[PDB]
Amino acid sequence: KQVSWKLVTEYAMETKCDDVLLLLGMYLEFQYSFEMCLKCIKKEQPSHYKYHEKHYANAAIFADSKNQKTICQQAVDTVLAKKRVDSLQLTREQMLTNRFNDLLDRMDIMFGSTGSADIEEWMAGVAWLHCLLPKMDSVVYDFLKCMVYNIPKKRYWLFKGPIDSGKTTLAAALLELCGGKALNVNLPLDRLNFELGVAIDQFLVVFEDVKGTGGESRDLPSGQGINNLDNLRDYLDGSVKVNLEKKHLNKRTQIFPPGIVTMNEYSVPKTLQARFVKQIDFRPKDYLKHCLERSEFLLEKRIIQSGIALLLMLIWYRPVAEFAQSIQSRIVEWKERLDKEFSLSVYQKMKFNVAMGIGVLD
Amino acid sequence: KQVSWKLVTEYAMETKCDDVLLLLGMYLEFQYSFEMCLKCIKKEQPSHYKYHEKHYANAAIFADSKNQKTICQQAVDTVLAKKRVDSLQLTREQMLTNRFNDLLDRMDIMFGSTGSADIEEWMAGVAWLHCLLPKMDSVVYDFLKCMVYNIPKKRYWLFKGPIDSGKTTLAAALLELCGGKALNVNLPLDRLNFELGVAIDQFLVVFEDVKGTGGESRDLPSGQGINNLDNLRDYLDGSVKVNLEKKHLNKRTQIFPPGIVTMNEYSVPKTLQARFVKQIDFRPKDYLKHCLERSEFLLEKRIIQSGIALLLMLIWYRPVAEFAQSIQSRIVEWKERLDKEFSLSVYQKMKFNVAMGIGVLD
Amino acid sequence: KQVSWKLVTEYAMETKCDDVLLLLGMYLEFQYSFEMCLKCIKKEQPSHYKYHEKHYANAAIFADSKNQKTICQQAVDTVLAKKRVDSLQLTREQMLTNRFNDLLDRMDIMFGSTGSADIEEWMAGVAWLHCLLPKMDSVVYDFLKCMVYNIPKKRYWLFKGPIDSGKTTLAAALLELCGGKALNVNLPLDRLNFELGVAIDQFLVVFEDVKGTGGESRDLPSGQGINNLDNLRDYLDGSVKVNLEKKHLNKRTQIFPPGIVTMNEYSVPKTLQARFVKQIDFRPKDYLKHCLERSEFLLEKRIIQSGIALLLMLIWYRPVAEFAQSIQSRIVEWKERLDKEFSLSVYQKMKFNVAMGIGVLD
Amino acid sequence: KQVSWKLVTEYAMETKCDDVLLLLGMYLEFQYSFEMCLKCIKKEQPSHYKYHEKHYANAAIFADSKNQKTICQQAVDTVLAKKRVDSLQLTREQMLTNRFNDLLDRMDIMFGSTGSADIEEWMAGVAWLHCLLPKMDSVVYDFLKCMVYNIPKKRYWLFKGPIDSGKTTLAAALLELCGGKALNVNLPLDRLNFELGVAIDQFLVVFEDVKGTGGESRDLPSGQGINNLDNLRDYLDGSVKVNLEKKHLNKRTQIFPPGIVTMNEYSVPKTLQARFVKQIDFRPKDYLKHCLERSEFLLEKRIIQSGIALLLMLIWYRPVAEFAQSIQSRIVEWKERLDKEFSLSVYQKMKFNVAMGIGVLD
Amino acid sequence: KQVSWKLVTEYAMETKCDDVLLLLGMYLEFQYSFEMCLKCIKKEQPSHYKYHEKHYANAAIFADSKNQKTICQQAVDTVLAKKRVDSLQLTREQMLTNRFNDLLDRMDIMFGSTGSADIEEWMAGVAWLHCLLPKMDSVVYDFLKCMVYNIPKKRYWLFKGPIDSGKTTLAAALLELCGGKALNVNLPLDRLNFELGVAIDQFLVVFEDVKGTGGESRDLPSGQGINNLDNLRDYLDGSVKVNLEKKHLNKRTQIFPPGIVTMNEYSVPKTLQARFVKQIDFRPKDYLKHCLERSEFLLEKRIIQSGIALLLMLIWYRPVAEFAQSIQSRIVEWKERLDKEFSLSVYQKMKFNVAMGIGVLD
DNA sequence: TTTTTTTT
């Protein structure tokens, strides 16, 4: 009796698997009797134990197949096709709505029965970030708007300050939240072709540490980034499509995603100052260092740099109406759980401790 | 029974879809009951909802096939082959009548029963655009004719002027009108010597932000582009056909399209000046800023960058005589609606509001 | 019943089509009934309407094939194999037979139904060229047959006159007539090696105006260019093969093609001077330049840079018995066309205008 | 009858083989009579002699197959697919316990009765290592935690000291313990592209003997290592994912591994001190050298370089609780075996011999 | 009925054809009705007309095949396989007999009834060559024997003398006779490495015009070649294998083949002098240039560059026993033709007339 | 056959 390629493709759709090897590896695990599947019994991976019983019968036949890689290839192509269809038809608003559902699904697991995440430690992170700048949650909403609206020539935010001032920590959390990618421009001009190629079909991008010149005035080593960026105004402006690379592949042509650039205190040509719609400056603060020193689970679990921490901040601080109609349903459930499990006094005790530079918990 | 690759390819032709993954994904949607189909019920996407009922039966059989990418590859190749046969056999006017049919079909949808936008906003756009430069509508008709007759040497156009003078905005609108592609000239030539290969089978191209020495005193760094374009005489003059590059695929040789170059105000070598038909000398125009500020919907919906706005302008301004007979039928029929939906006093009142720096609507 | 692969191959041979997508696109059109075929009715394209009725039955069955691109790939291989067999086997004269026909085929278009070129202004080019120097149709015929015979040492002509005296412009016209390419030698010696690689397999070559040292005093741009040529003894003589080089690619051996050198009036080592068959003075002549200034279509349509204008000069002046033995027949309808379109008196009047320096058609 | 592909896939999995040729060559050996297999009888290779009898029947049929390389390719994919599944789903602690279990398995052979090694010599090596630095075993534990926790911007240790002072010796042992790669960055900036590609999916990296610039008064050569590192800040900090390269392969996104930098006595920017968690100063010491000369079987067998030696040190020194839970059973058994075979006096005698610079053994 | 792949393999072998496209093209020509074949009837290409009559029936069936290129690929592989087998197993003696048989076949054509050149024209060539140096025939016999034995150290011959003194003329004819490559070592040390790669798997190499440094006392321009050669001593001595490299490609290891060195009368190191078997001095002699000046068909037909002329000289001068037994029958036939064609009186008249420096013929 | 190499 033959393998159902249909059942395989459906698993890859359900789990959104992009990699033929990852798909192959995981589907093989289903060959063993789910009745005794130690992994299922220990509930260690949703993408396994949700599926093993359903796929077991087909996986036994797949284990014998001589075609295996071909079956997986067709499955991955279907998931890739679904992505291109979506990328060419969704509004950016709908795209963000989908991303939030993915994160909320992960949160339901993290704080779920398996429950590995202590929501107390995660909410401590929210207090730390809300402390990092005035009106923090308002600034996040402004960033989200302009990423959604993607207004031409008003498309990039500039993060500037001295070192150890948290700007890349914030950028990392924002980047996880929207699911962009990071890129280098402190490079020779040739290499940029395949480098910038990975921006293909991403929602957002981040450029790090772009280097000005004469920076040794400020002990900054002078470098390529700023002058490479003035060579790229059109990619910033997003006013027209551009052509993007891959090895062993043709171009694809598209408008280039919006995003964020991070800066030591170099000087900048005003052609670029014209193009950054907004700038915010970060400045070091002693009590934050003391707090982290007392509370290193914030770093060790990477809480302060996760988009999950930003999402919790928004759920706490923003009206339900600021979210799209579909997710408002889930937003309501999460607002309930947070309010129930964190009395305002608890959060105030936390935010107090952070401001004092004390260990957040007491 | 078995998949009709014929019915597949008919969809590919009729959608003009020429991406194998896009096609693959698109067709797979039809596997579900069209009678229940939520996208059909929404009338969400024309390239779905017109076809779902027709292709449903074949797509069910497609959904079980094991040849799925191979089926799509043949289907895409007939679409691409059709473009090739057209690209040599059709006369340039005939090409434009095809392109204008394409844009009119979109306009039929946009201002269709969905009212996906309101033409009042787009006509405010027409007013804002015609407000840019003297006799604006007329200059476009001259440029169109230059690209039609494609006369050698007198074959390229310069836009010169400061940032936020709108030259890129004009360029974006013209390219969205014609179809064609952009390129960057500010490169080492042996890099550009592959990128020029993009021009294949295109009607038009545009070259962005040429840089040269003698700008750098004005926050306007020099670049290779000025000398590159001075040297790219073949591509410019169009007095002969030239090679165009590809990867894992053969080159071809053909006439290089006509086109436009944009500059901020570097110098120009006189022989390169002499290779233009014309130059146009963009400026700030202060009250437009004020209008735009109120008129945020203009940029949010990208109206003033989009060739659809130009098409509404030429319909509004030009004699019905300016077009080929078959489209003159559609021109007349569509030109009716503008009276049904505007008085001239409204159009006057709009351009007045523009001139007055008001929000265009009242 | 089945696709004849044979019939597809015949059509590819008859079209001499060497593009698989083009062949695919073309042949698919025959699947509709030839009996109504509107391209046939309109007699638009012989490569269609000559063939449809024969191929129709096979094209229908072809359109149902699942293998289509494979059929076409074999057909294109056949045409490429044919070219390679001939390319190895045939003589310089037989190859000249080809580029002759290619140039006549272009003229049948350029002055055909489109009227894209004004045959009068182009024959006025023939006149203006013919008055540069003595008997120019003979001077061409002498040079041309010299390039066919490719006799060792007897292979290179020198142009030596001051600026604007025509050598560059003439060299351009010569290249259009012939194909081939020009070359730079005004260089440090390392560069010459890849430069010379351009000559590989060219039917003719040129050397760009030499930086002759012994030009310093003449206020000419000057240097090793001439001493490089004097050093490169053997390549000109072409008695024996030599190696040639391309970047990122291996060495190759050729008899170095025959060609032309041009200069302003440098002083010359008589060793190098002894290598030439002819050296030709050029004088700037007021009547020539002022006629051009009165006749600028000659420049704008680059008629004087047209090698096709040289082919007209052959067709007009030279006797039928001088052209390629059988293709002489094809020349006579061209002579007949020109003889009908142009009395000798109008060509004479034309020459008499430039004989007054008056614009040719004035 | 037919080949069981499944049995081949099992053999690949059981041997964890992932070279197609190694797998092929290995499997082919089973085709001869198991009952006479001299390799089995001589008990030379366990990956042979465990398996020949099981696989024999299928190996004979495989020997006749016409598909041999395709059969092997599917088997190697299965092993590679498992590695990627693990790379995404395992915790860093689990990865380390898997690595430990494999070393412990290798130790079981070496000190098996069939084993070649002498546990007294291997224990002698531990005495030399525990003399190389203060509190050596505690330093190993602190480093292991540092790599398991992988705390961003607290991920890298700096080894520096004179030449012939044991830094690369110690790095090699840690690298064999954990698995990882060494890398060279005293390079031109371009080859760094592919060089950093080597880090892909590794656990550790070691940057070996980076060169500073200047201060050749220190007798140090100069090179670009430190100037490259001061650029590569993002790869050290490990705050965000980066994109890595391989020849003929498209760019791969992951967070960059933690690791070690080794360096002779160059001075260093504080910008790089700011990125190293800890700095260890190695020093040359006479009694180590004098002991080592008399104890040179240590060198001959590479005992001092090898991760087995560090693992033995941890088993001797560390409490059982510090090992992850599942291995505590095996660790206890090895502790008992060590105690059975060495008194404290023997170990303490060895250390005294090392301190006295006599040969370790007596 | 079916294609015989064997018949295609045989044709490919007898024609020694290496190109798929070439073989494909050739074989398709046999499908047209053999009896009418104008190519047969003109008797031009022997690789056609010797075979068309035989292969005709198979060519018809091949013309209908669906997998034609696969047939031709296998045939070409058979030809390529035999070449590598021979490269590894032939004696140098046998290689030369094979090389000679090829030339003898071309001579049977050139002087057959269809032969376009005339044997009297070529015997004029032999007479002129015999006058260039004393004992010319015996010199050539010695040189060939030297290459055939390839005795180490006794491997290389030196040509020196003024410009236009015939040294490269002779090298060309020898290289045409034996097969091989020229090389240029007037280079910096880096470029030599790829240059020496040209020698890979050749029979001879010629180092052309290695310049010495200094010696402008003789007006010889200085250059590095001689200094480069004195480093390369081991390549010349030929006593042990060397490593050779090519662009994009690996090393190869082999004995560097024997060859010829040419130059003007530079100084020599005594070390380099000792590495040569013989020095042969060239000098201008006026009666040769006056003879050429009155028999330029020698140059025009490139007779004196040709190894065919050398082979003709060997046949005229040397005993039958000096040839290898395999070809002695063809040699005797060719001698008998020549003796019947020319009386000694004719040849003696030619030689004397050349000594008078008059045109060869009377 | 690109990409890597080579060109630089």
Ligand SMILES: Nc1ncnc2c1ncn2[C@@H]1O[C@H](COP(=O)(O)OP(=O)(O)OP(=O)(O)O)[C@@H](O)[C@H]1O
């Ligand atoms: N505002 C701040 N004041 C004091 N310490 C800070 C602040 N922000 C971050 N930190 C500390 O600095 C560490 C590094 O933060 P981060 O990498 O985000 O800084 P950065 O300025 O963006 O750095 P870089 O320019 O090197 O990328 C954090 O882990 C935290 O310990």
Ligand SMILES: Nc1ncnc2c1ncn2[C@@H]1O[C@H](COP(=O)(O)OP(=O)(O)OP(=O)(O)O)[C@@H](O)[C@H]1O
């Ligand atoms: N003539 C104008 N006067 C004032 N503002 C203008 C004008 N034209 C455009 N703008 C503003 O500048 C923005 C950018 O316009 P656009 O990119 O077309 O200008 P540009 O001159 O081509 O600029 P750049 O050289 O930076 O690409 C527009 O979206 C609009 O907000």
Ligand SMILES: Nc1ncnc2c1ncn2[C@@H]1O[C@H](COP(=O)(O)OP(=O)(O)OP(=O)(O)O)[C@@H](O)[C@H]1O
């Ligand atoms: N003999 C001539 N007398 C006058 N005008 C001429 C003559 N020959 C050419 N012309 C015109 O002068 C232009 C420039 O001529 P051209 O570049 O061919 O001269 P050149 O001798 O090669 O010059 P240069 O040495 O400056 O490059 C031509 O394109 C043509 O328009």
Ligand SMILES: Nc1ncnc2c1ncn2[C@@H]1O[C@H](COP(=O)(O)OP(=O)(O)OP(=O)(O)O)[C@@H](O)[C@H]1O
């Ligand atoms: N602390 C030490 N005291 C004395 N001799 C030492 C010491 N460490 C190493 N040696 C000797 O130096 C040899 C080389 O050791 P190793 O290669 O680790 O040196 P290194 O200085 O750390 O090298 P590198 O600079 O290349 O990393 C050892 O085999 C041993 O003979």
Ligand SMILES: Nc1ncnc2c1ncn2[C@@H]1O[C@H](COP(=O)(O)OP(=O)(O)OP(=O)(O)O)[C@@H](O)[C@H]1O
């Ligand atoms: N010995 C000679 N006496 C007189 N004329 C000669 C002699 N040898 C060659 N020639 C003339 O010189 C021309 C060039 O000959 P050739 O290329 O062989 O000279 P070469 O000195 O060996 O050259 P090169 O310096 O390039 O190695 C010949 O075609 C002939 O006209």
